[PDB]
Amino acid sequence: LGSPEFIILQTYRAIADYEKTSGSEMALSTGDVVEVVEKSESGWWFCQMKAKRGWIPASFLEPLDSPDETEDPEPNYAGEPYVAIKAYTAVEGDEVSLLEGEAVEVIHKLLDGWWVIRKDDVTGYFPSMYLQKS
Amino acid sequence: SPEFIILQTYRAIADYEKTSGSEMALSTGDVVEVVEKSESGWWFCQMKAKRGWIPASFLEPLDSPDEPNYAGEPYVAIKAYTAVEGDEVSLLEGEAVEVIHKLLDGWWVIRKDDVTGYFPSMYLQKS
């Protein structure tokens, strides 16, 4: 486990495009916002792009090295009881339409938020965010 | 933020366009660091650091676009350099100069005899 540390860096904006001529340099596009790590009287500054951040769909990612090893929990074909807390109308042919308050059996809690559920004789995908444990 | 964190690194396999402000856009091949995993199917990530050396002159403060020296400081060229632009100065190793402005972008204003102009600071040394 690591320890997070925030280093307050001065920020600047690129006024023109810059193309790398050597490996330790960084390309710039007009308007890029960068953080300054170290300044050199040579006129060269060691910088890093101000990183973008935010919520993204897990399903759009794969592990760096073990991309074939699935990280999902195992299915539970016996099923676990949940109830729909918000109605949802299936869009895709493999999705399940539920009304608010309907009870279902969760059989696969996929990491991507689209869980496999069972409702009587029907099986399909349903948003985990619209389900709550009974 | 949190006391401790194990940061996991993943790779984007498809392009993603943000539909709300709290999301992040992705381009295939992007390398991201995962901060928090939600059972909702959303993971909070930051793009892996991209860094390197860049020219100070290509930068400006986030806010805004922004004296004569008659007695220059003695320096000597340590490496030959031939002027590229018309306002640059050509020097051979060993040639002494007067440094007028020690500008931070690596191109100092110098003077030698009846010539003045810009010269790489990295090729000058105090004399």
């Binding site: 919520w55 769909p57 897990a58 399903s59 759009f60 895709e92 991507d112 938020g113 689209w114 995908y125 948003p127 985990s128 965010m129 619209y130 | 396999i13 498809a14 993603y16 539909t19 709300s20 709290s22 999301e23 939600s38 909702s40 199917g41 959303w42 909070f44």
Partner: peptide, 11 residues
């Protein structure tokens, strides 16, 4: 808190 809509289906 994550977005208030489910993520897209996998690509």
């Amino acid at each position: 808190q994550p977005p208030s809509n489910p993520p897209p289906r996998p690509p």
